[PDB]
Symmetry: C2
Subunit: 449 residues, 2 copies
């Protein structure tokens, strides 16, 4: 039952051109904040990650989708907020590496240890460290791992795989890139093979392609990783209808959803940003991607389904949800694809907050693994990188810039970024914290050994 308030509205209250019209607040917040502070146990935890969703990304998406004075009913609704650092480590010196990749940062909040770019579930000495999901399982809690990316991708993989390189998707890549993790060499196996061992109750995302590979050793040698999953009691789903049909998910009948060969389709389509794209060409208006359709579950749908199936566990559950393509489209200098995935994440957050407020003992956290490239710049900007003009909900033009790479892919940035929470122990994301603190916050909130 509700007691801890979720922000109902932080949109501009009135006429932004008039006095007080742009205010997002309507009164003193001292009482609301006191009502948002509780150190009682968190029975469940829902961690939503917007890959590469730094403050710049959130703002850009709000400006376009909700207007500058708009409000994300999900993402902007968490009452307790802070900024956290996500630097990685140089593998050889052990010193800080100011700009992390996704594997090292995900490893940080999932295990509580800093590591080098490319590492998954291991530290700079390549020592494995239990993940919050594995720990949740060990304590008897149900577990969920959701993502719009291929499941072998760094973010969701970090919770169930321990490999020296995030490139080790299946047996093939592992034998070549992670010889020490290769199953035929006595290791724990590829990311996909370990994911199958982790056996989370609910796992949803893309990445069906790798399951086509066959094991090089072990009990299921010669069989495809898909056959192995089937043989190990997994219930495989491939689309919205089949997913909807699922009535239960547990260790006896673990759910594995493979909704795309690789990454799942993005929500919006738009051209890539170009050189002086905001000076020469006209303004862009994003448009829905036909490849999305109803046969493909949305992030909000996968979130709702996971909560349903996971909440059946009376002891509690841990669930991670990732809006993976915000980062990917940021890399491809594509504003529409980028913003569309942020809107996507916001819906997933709303579903989490909606459940969390009713349940009353659920901690919800929303943040990103690292900052990214996109910047909001003046309309008449003449930049050296890639830019694009966009027609926002405000009926005005917003220009986005990607200027940190001459190479084909735009890159991550080291700036600290927003982390927000709601529920029991949400106080621990306020002020300045580190990405590794999040692991300890989740561990403590659930009261894990």
């Amino acid at each position: 039952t509700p007691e801890m308030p979720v922000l109902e509205n932080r949109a501009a209250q009135g006429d932004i051109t008039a006095p007080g019209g742009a205010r997002r607040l309507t009164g003193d917040q001292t009482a609301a904040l006191r009502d948002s502070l509780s150190d009682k146990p968190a029975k469940n935890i829902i961690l939503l990650i917007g890959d590469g969703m730094g403050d710049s990304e959130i703002t850009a998406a709000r400006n376009y989708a909700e207007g500058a004075g708009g409000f994300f009913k999900g993402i902007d609704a968490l009452p307790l907020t802070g900024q956290y650092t996500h630097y990685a480590l140089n593998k050889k010196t052990g010193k800080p590496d100011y700009v992390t990749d996704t594997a090292a940062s995900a490893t940080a909040w999932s295990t509580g240890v800093k590591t080098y770019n490319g590492a998954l579930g291991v530290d700079i000495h390549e020592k494995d460290h239990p993940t919050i999901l594995e720990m949740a399982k060990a304590a008897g809690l149900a577990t969920g791992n959701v993502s719009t990316a291929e499941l072998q991708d760094a973010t969701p993989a970090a919770l169930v795989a321990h490999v020296t390189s995030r490139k080790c998707y299946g047996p093939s890549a592992t034998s070549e890139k992670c010889p020490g993790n290769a199953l035929e060499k006595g290791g724990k196996g590829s990311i996909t093979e370990q994911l199958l061992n982790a056996r989370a109750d609910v796992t949803l995302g893309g990445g069906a392609k790798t399951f086509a590979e066959t094991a090089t050793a072990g009990e299921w040698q010669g069989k495809t990783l898909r056959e192995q999953a089937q043989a190990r009691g997994y219930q495989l789903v491939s689309d919205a209808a089949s997913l909807n049909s699922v009535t239960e998910a547990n260790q006896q009948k673990p759910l594995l959803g493979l909704f795309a060969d690789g990454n799942m389709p993005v929500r919006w389509l738009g051209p890539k940003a170009t050189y002086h794209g905001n000076i020469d060409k006209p303004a862009v208006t994003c448009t829905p991607n036909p490849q999305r359709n109803d046969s493909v579950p949305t992030l909000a749908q996968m979130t709702d389904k996971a909560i349903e199936l996971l909440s059946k566990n009376e002891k509690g559950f841990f669930l991670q949800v990732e809006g993976a393509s915000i980062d990917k489209q940021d890399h491809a200098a594509n504003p529409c694809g980028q913003i569309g995935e942020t809107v996507d994440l916001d819906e997933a957050v709303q579903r989490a907050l909606e459940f969390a407020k009713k349940e009353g003992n659920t901690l919800v956290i929303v943040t990103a693994d690292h900052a990214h490239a996109s910047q909001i710049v003046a309309p008449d900007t003449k930049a050296p990188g890639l830019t694009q003009a966009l027609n926002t909900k405000d009926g005005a033009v917003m220009v986005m810039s990607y200027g940190n790479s001459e190479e084909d892919s735009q890159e991550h940035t080291g700036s600290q970024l927003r982390i927000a929470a709601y529920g029991p122990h949400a106080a621990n994301v306020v002020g300045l914290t580190d990405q590794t603190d999040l692991f300890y916050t989740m561990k403590a909130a659930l009261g894990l050994k």
Copy 2:
């Protein structure tokens, strides 16, 4: 034992290469945050603005001067944090202009009304609106306006001047660019003339250059603004010694510190970023500015003296302190200058918080007017803009990039950014808020009118 705590130490607690070594937290923060919430009246308010100090700028400065796992005993010590928006307005359409200049954003928190870029103390209809400082004085409180920039610059000018274009420093510029404001045309006059009229208790900064002009009309026609100042009872100083000599600052003896012809000198010097600078040039170690001097008050000293002189007003006081050159050096693509001015601001913040913790009824706020260009990128980055490698306190290299402008000056970015506070009503900066909300938060905290 001051009820409300100031974050003592949120640096990495140990060996960052070890599990938990990078944690900034040592325990649950629920109790600490509760102790930080109070709705009692704020007797005093100290507003510190890092011009252009976005989260990226804060992160870069911390990385270089304190190390990635370091901690700004000032900037990072405020316990209540949020993210706010600072979009401006298109003067003709009234629609949002996603990237604001300094004038419009300062007007936003100074008057509570959004406006067009370049405007100072007026809305899009060119109508004046009271500033938090003008209101504080009228309420019988002591008023202080401190900056490391020429006092006619947008940030400190927004608290005492109402003109259509921030370029209207003195009579000359005003008659040409702000005719409707030009004194000899019935207007209230230029920025400097209006500043003299505002007559704040303490005004410290640079910009003596403009005081050489002579009024075109009014009671002090033909007389220089400096002369007018002296003739109107103003107590002027021009160096550290002369400033340290003042023992009182009031309406009959208003203090006016002019320590430089234009902007005050920066703390650190370094090479300007260049094309592929991080690749073609050696990593840089910032060098102290020989011109920094010792007869020139530091931001921290001006801040400290302002508090001494203003704290005598039993009613209370309002003080705004601006670390102005963070932005200016960010425009110049000079990491060392930018970082040094952030370190400078941090010292002033420490003084503010030290006083606030003992006074017990002081609201301290640290934020910025808008985001900027600088980004922290990977060491091997090959970007199209300007870059540079730096030797940080960690004994590691950090690369910074400025890639949003082929023109002479790097530009602002529209990303929402950090705002933090300590003391009575500090809860009002938590979560998502708008820059105009800051005006009402300060007004209500002091309980004006």
